[PDB]
Amino acid sequence: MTLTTVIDIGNFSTKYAYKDKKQIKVGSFPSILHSYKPLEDYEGMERVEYNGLDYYVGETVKNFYFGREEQMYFGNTRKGHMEGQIRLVYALYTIFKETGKKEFNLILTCPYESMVTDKKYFVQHFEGEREVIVEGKSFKFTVHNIVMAAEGLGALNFSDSLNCVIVDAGSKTLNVLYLINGSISKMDSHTINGGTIDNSIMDLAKTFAKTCSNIDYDYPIVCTGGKAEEMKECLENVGYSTVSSAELGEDKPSYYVNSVGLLLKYGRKFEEMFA
């Protein structure tokens, strides 16, 4: 089993760094969800029942919110929970299906300052033996050592010799990881509201600038997540020089990086960490 599982609970969509031995695939899906099981002859989303929680998940959910073009997202989660649980669940289910396997080596990411809280969160609700019913189909599984990490951290693998900052332009969350050498400057790094959905890239860019005026314009700024490329472009227009987007090697658009990169770079570390 084991199975390194670096999973991103992204507020827009989730994803899974599916190492798959030879090549990392991505177990992704729309993280939009909706409560209540008992709809009727449905299909599309799937009924997820876990920890006394009852949600539909899957593409069709958008139809479930038709007209309510707002509730669709549960963003600015400076922390995991509550719907995040479901996101993780369904992911685990998804990749379970993909692998046909149980016990996961769970590695989660979140806004740096929330990591402690989130560890508490998911440990309580996922650490150890757990089981879920999806669409009437049960599923037992377990995690023994949930590893938490900083959201967007994975971009470091493309961040040439970064001793500075990663900018994570996600859904409605903006992460700033001021990495130095190869660690996280807690005392400087922070997460910013909102993100891509609620306002313009330029709005974010300017917001970022305000929040991190301590950044030298010639810092190596690496932009990841969502509109990473466009964000990078705008940041240049703001006036930052050495700014780059974390191109994810293969045809795996921007927003995929996060977890994929984290696996790609740290992998072995977590093979040791979890084990």
Residues that bind a copy of itself (CB under 8 A): 11, 35-36, 38-42, 44, 60, 63-64, 66-68, 70-79, 81-83, 163-164, 172, 180-181, 183-187, 193-194, 198, 203, 206-207, 209-211, 213-220, 238-239
CB 87 within 8 A of CB 74: no
- Residue 217 interacts with, from a copy of itself, ligand ANP, none (CB under 5-8 Å by kind): a copy of itself
The one among 4, 5, 13, 114 contacting ligand ANP by CB under 6 A: 13
According to the annotation, is 31 in a ligand binding site?
no
- Residue 225 interacts with, from ligand ANP, a copy of itself, none (CB under 5-8 Å by kind): ligand ANP
According to the annotation, is 15 in a ligand binding site?
yes
To ligand ANP, the closest distance from the beta carbon of 87 in angstroms equals 10
According to the annotation, is 12 in a ligand binding site?
yes
To ligand ANP, the closest distance from the beta carbon of 170 in angstroms equals 2
Residue 100: asked if its preceding bond is cis (omega within 30°), the reply is no
According to the annotation, is 8 in a ligand binding site?
yes
- Residue 255 interacts with, from ligand ANP, a copy of itself, none (CB under 5-8 Å by kind): ligand ANP
User: Between residues 11 and 105, which has the closer beta carbon with respect to ligand ANP?
Assistant: 11
8 belongs to the binding site for ligand ANP (CB under 6 A): yes
CB 146 within 8 A of CB 122: yes
CA–CA distances in Å: residue 265 to residues 66, 180, 268, 270: 40, 16, 8, 10
Long-range contacts of residues 72-75, Cβ cutoff 8 Å, at least 24 apart: 72/32, 73/11, 73/12, 73/32, 73/171, 73/172, 73/197, 74/11, 74/31, 74/33, 75/11, 75/12, 75/171, 75/172, 75/173, 75/194, 75/195, 75/197, 75/198
Q: Which amino acid is at 33?
A: L
To a copy of itself, the closest distance from the beta carbon of 144 in angstroms equals 22
According to the annotation, is 28 in a ligand binding site?
no
In the window 135-194, what residues touch ligand ANP (CB under 6 A)? 151, 168, 170-171, 173
| Residue keyed to tokens 């921007």 | 254
To a copy of itself, the closest distance from the beta carbon of 219 in angstroms equals 6
For residue 146, give the DSSP letter: P
Q: Which residues bind ligand ANP (CB under 6 A)?
A: 8, 10-13, 28, 30, 151, 168, 170-171, 173, 195-196, 225-226, 255, 258
